[PDB]
Amino acid sequence: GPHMTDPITNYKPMDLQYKTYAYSMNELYHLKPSLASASYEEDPLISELVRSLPKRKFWRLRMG
């Protein structure tokens, strides 16, 4: 039974020695794109990445 209010969602380790980049779940969720940034204002470089993903047939979604 996960909920956004779970305290794990705000946790991030501090005083790291090896890793520079760590983010809490909430920090990452705040960086979710807006509808515009995922469509009609999408960064063209991100659009190229999306266009490189497989076509739907790759996943074999009908194979039970």
């Binding site: 969602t9 779940m25 807006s34 995922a38 990445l49």
Partner: protein, 181 residues
Amino acid sequence: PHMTVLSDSVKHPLNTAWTLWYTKPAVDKSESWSDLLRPVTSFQTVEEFWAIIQNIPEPHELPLKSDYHVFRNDVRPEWEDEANAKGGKWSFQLRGAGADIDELWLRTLLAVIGETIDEDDSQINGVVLSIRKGGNKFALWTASEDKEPLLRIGGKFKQVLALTDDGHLEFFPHSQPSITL
């Protein structure tokens, strides 16, 4: 409130690059693991991650016997890979309705790419979602069997999965579990 993948509401680097892999469901009795496992894409920023996960199927759409794997770049999601060969996996099997699969998977991915549950001296090499008839599974793949680091990771993983009972998380060395939490 719940976290969702799709936007039905300065780049930010990740500690490592990651590659998303898929295990396809077989269409016949001839296809092997080596035929079915394919890399999909790589990413190394938060922005790239979100663009990928918003444009691939959600867990609830995936067919029986498929897997998603998200592993640090240059690590294959295989027990034979040099980086995994001395390790194992913490695995949780969601028995029952499992209506929370999409959110559980999202939370797990965020915690993995965000480096929040791994040790600073990294153990986690990747994470695997497995779609199976008896209940879908979530697994963290580790580079070692070191007990105290594994127990720290395991306790944090239980929180990510919103588990409150004991006995739900099992560690399987890549060689019946050797640790249960």
